[PDB]
Amino acid sequence: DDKAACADGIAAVKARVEKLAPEAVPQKLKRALKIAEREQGEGEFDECLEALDDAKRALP
Amino acid sequence: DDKAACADGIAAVKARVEKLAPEAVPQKLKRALKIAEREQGEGEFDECLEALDDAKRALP
Ligand SMILES: [La+3]
């Protein structure tokens, strides 16, 4: 289910970032996380999944 | 261009509604117009076009 994968995917990325130094978290990673959350909040769970890919591609 | 069609499509729907009595404009027509404008504002011009179809399907 896209809704389940979106909620789990957001959790997974946040779990990975919480292990980074807060001053080392790139701005484009935050921005992709917030776009995923926006699309989640709009019920476009497929677009949330696409923004999570950009968030993952932005992890150090 | 989806961006051009989205901006023109919003204009066309508003032009058609401005000829309705304001108390006769259905709520789901306003709601579809605002979703199209939201998606336009997000740069998702293809989704704006899809919401315009729902707006057109909601005209009396
Ligand atoms: La959206």
**Residues A29, A59 contacting (CB under 8 angstroms):** yes
Residue of B nearest to A42 (CA): B35
Rounded Cα distance between B10 and B37, Å, is 8
Q: Tokens 């150090």 identify what position?
A: A60
**What's the distance, CA B18 to chain centroid?**
12
* Chain A residue set in contact with B, beta carbons under 8 Å: 38, 42, 44, 47
Scored b (16 or more CB within 10 A) or e, B2-41 reads eeeebeebbeebeeebeeeeeeebeeebeebbebbeebbe
Tell how far the Cα of B31 is from the centroid of ligand 1, in angstroms: 14
Find the helix or strand (DSSP H, E) in which B46 lies. helix B45-56
**What single DSSP character describes residue B26?**
-
- The upper half-sphere exposure of residue B40, i.e. CA atoms within 13 Å in the direction of its Cβ, equals 21
Taking contacts as CB-CB distances below 8 angstroms, the residues of chain A near B47 are 44
- Count of pairs with CB atoms under 8 A, one residue in A, one in B: 4
C-alpha to C-alpha distances, B38 to A38, A49, B3, B32, B41, nearest whole angstrom: 12, 20, 13, 10, 5
